[model samples]
Target: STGSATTTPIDSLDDAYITPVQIGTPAQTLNLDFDTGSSDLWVFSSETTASEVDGQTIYTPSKSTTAKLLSGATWSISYGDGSSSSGDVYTDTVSVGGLTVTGQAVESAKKVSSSFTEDSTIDGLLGLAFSTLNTVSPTQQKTFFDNAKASLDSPVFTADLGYHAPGTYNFGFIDTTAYTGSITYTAVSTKQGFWEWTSTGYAVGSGTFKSTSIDGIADTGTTLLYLPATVVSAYWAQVSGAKSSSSVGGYVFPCSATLPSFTFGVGSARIVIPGDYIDFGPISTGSSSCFGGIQSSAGIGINIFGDVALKAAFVVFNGATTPTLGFASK
Candidate 1:
């Protein structure tokens, strides 16, 4: 129960290689991608082709005195965005903080693409989202949480992205100073690992929802908030001259004249998506253009809150107790 799942960002790419926080004592420095789309810990190896390895960081066993290679096994991964990487498997002694995990499964990608190699800031990605989305197998491994659990003094972990900057992803035992009080707990839905919720609908300004029912999930992996079309239209109806256009395969609105404050209730927990987040910088749709925090994805099953919605709150994925999420004030 100590082992759980989480997510982190790959920062940036340098030359072509992504660097992740080193694993093992004196932590064996390597490159990894923090992916929310999948759950697996791997790196590039020496056997990888020089061409495919350009702009990519390769982990040579000789470089890391503590690293180990998984002989004879093949590993492959493909993302929803059509990106793919593959290579051989290896075991290594991974370290984080003062803890060291021995014989952890790691993959060394032999072939990589330009897309991954180009970004200099992103060298690796850490996938802490959920185990259900893992691409590799035995699929039962605990990932970062599994290896780091034994070394932790408490059975809890917190992801601190608020520090350094907005996108900097950090993890470790939850620091009590970061929270206001006890975390608001929510049970995980039976379907996959999405965070399920029943919202009473949206409230513009100080207004409250007329209805008292709706269900959804909070996801940091998704870049945008996917909501029901009817709900989107209903919420926008409150804002005059709010026009919807298609860009990035989703509907975006122009909120030049007036910006409306929107809030949604999760059971009794009322969460507000700030007006600035709705504007979310200007798109090509003119100067006063704004992106709505909520979008129409009617039959997409569950509503996903995405990173925009998550930035305002401190979240905890409590897999140690039951499959649940804990929310706290930032």
Candidate 2:
């Protein structure tokens, strides 16, 4: 009665998750980035400039018997990371795991920035947000989950992200067996078109809770965890040699420094982030210099609970009318 799909991280870069999806009538498969921060289903395709494309696999609409071109329609997107892409629109059947939806708006890219052009392995992005934020011109587009939820057994999905391992993103149902204990829920605000929520308490390592609210977005596409500036600054204070450098940009500590664990509240529940998860490996050319995976949200407007934070728990993105979020320890 429920549909499910497994998604894994690509690029030893450890920056994003990729899921296999089908497009067109006969089903041409492509590796797509499953993003929660934005809306719109766009792919690198035949319309893309050949010279601009690096090594990414492109979608050929003419090969699909059911593909229909929506002439004159276009889409363009720019991300905070300075990545940008744009293209024409097409309607086609899209299949993800056991679920399939007909007439989904599939944006095909004609132009892409260096961030995308450099990641030759990714074909496109599969947005999991509400359709209201879709970037398509003239009209908005519904995501695969939004288009298929009414037909699903339940209007909820679960993300089980693992460290250095393949993770599963289930559609239409929550598998209790995937997570330990009960799922704690919190309210979500759609005003920003993000899975925005707040943590009521916080602690570093085995320390005491600060009992302050930390607001942020739960984003799977983003690579690092982000918190408030003062919060992040206080965290580094606990680390012996950690300091902020203009050259480093982010907080950095000697690779040998013991990274403190992080714990934050989600409704009545608290998820703990391990220290090793905070160590984002060496920075630039030096093996002794390490960068913290958690950064400050000072100028970014909103904090991001990205791969580092999401991987620390089993997350549920509830798509029902009330639209709440649920989290449980993995």
Top candidate by lDDT: 2
lDDT of 2 by residue, 113-132 (tens): 98898887789999987778
Candidate 2 lDDT = 0.87
lDDT of each: 0.56, 0.87
lDDT for position 45 in model 2:
92
* Model 2's TM-score against the true structure: 0.97
> Which candidate tops TM-score?
2
Clashing pairs in 2: none
Error at 268, model 1, angstroms: 1.3
Poorest 10 consecutive residues by lDDT, candidate 1? 10-19
Q: After superposition, how far is residue 139 of candidate 1 from its true place, in Å?
A: 6.5
Give model 1's TM-score versus the native structure. Answer: 0.76
